[PDB]
């Protein structure tokens, strides 16, 4: 199966605060594994899953200094951006980064990622070639030119193809993957006509499809139960007496094949 | 393995 690593980083400035708040979250296979928060009493990268406790003290020391370096980088970048957009003092501002790698089932690099947002909107991104930059904003051209002239892309490329892949291999070995199939049931709610609501519960990961049918409806967005698993439902308003004409189908990666269900 | 950025914006 395929694999991935991501670091999602955020710095926020506020009218009062002397220094921005910086938060970094690391993910392996879309599951949080490390976290740094500058608001902590003694800010350090901390493990977020049990399998990371295997890493010794020098690992945490190095990563913590990386994060403190990022915190400085974000502080300076936030200041530079304020200038680029002619934003005055007295506002709140946000700078975000996503970076990392996707591996195929063979554990080889499929794609590197490096994108940034200012005020929640795309600012600059490293293209899939890992050599050139896309920047929409006129203000972002200043940064694009600066990074073209400094050769920033070659260095990010080296990280993405080297370190990102190599350390993801090490984390997949130490973390040795699993999924939880959805348990489904249909509820019955008489109204004017009855609402049949098909429930999917206890599943992981969150990606799932629910359909009602012969031929292909209200729903909710997939939501966390709070215990590591997810929930979803879909409903249809259906004639009283004729509820057996309708069948709910649940598609999830953990299923040997799609579940088919009806009101019983 | 956290990324360490290069040139500032």
């Amino acid at each position: 199966g395929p694999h991935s690593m991501r670091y999602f980083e955020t710095a926020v400035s506020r009218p009062g605060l002397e220094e921005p708040r910086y938060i970094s979250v690391g993910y392996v296979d879309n599951k949080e594994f490390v976290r740094f928060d500058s608001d902590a009493e003694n800010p350090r990268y901390e493990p977020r899953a049990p399998w990371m406790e295997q890493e010794g003290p020098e690992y945490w020391e190095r990563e913590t200094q990386k994060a403190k370096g990022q915190e400085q980088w974000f502080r300076v970048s936030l200041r530079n951006l304020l200038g680029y957009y002619n934003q005055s003092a007295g506002g709140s501002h946000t700078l975000q980064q996503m970076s990392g790698c996707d591996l195929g089932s063979d554990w080889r690099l499929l794609r590197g990622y490096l994108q940034f947002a200012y005020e929640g909107r795309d600012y600059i991104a490293l293209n899939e070639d890992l050599k050139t930059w896309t920047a929409a904003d006129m203000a972002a051209q200043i940064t694009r030119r600066k990074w073209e002239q400094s050769g920033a892309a070659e260095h990010y490329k080296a990280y993405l193809e080297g370190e990102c892949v190599e350390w993801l291999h090490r984390y997949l070995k130490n973390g040795n993957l699993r999924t939880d199939s959805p348990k489904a049931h249909v509820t019955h709610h008489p109204r004017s006509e009855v609402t049949l609501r098909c429930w999917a519960l206890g599943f992981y990961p969150a990606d799932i499809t629910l359909t009602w049918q012969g031929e292909e409806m209200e729903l909710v967005e997939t939501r966390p139960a709070g215990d590591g698993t997810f929930q979803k439902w879909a409903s249809v308003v259906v004639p009283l007496g004729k509820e057996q004409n309708y069948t709910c189908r649940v598609y999830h990666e953990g299923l040997p094949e799609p579940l088919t269900l009806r009101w019983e | 393995k956290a990324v360490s950025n290069f040139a500032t914006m």
Binding site: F8, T10, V12, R14, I23, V25, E32, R35, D37, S92, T94, Q96, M98, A117, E119, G120, R121, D122, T187, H189, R197, L201, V220, E221, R223, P224, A225, G226, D227, Q231, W233 | -
Partner: protein
Amino acid sequence: IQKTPQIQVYSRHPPENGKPNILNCYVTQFHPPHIEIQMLKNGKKIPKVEMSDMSFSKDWSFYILAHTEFTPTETDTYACRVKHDSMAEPKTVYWDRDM
């Protein structure tokens, strides 16, 4: 610029009156990340509400899960109330045990 929070209120386990459960308030798709979330019983703030750490999605919007222990009853009404700069007034979503 502002993105308005989407809110769902729902229990962790299938609700049964009299039986302790966990009530969730799942707030997504918002920007800026500063937000006030309160969970209410009969219109009054519940004091001991647990808050997930804030995270953001691949579209750069922020999300967070608030939760609290509660015991559903036939007559008590639960809700989540959110204040965010994208909305002039707070937004309240009521728990419906069937949703």
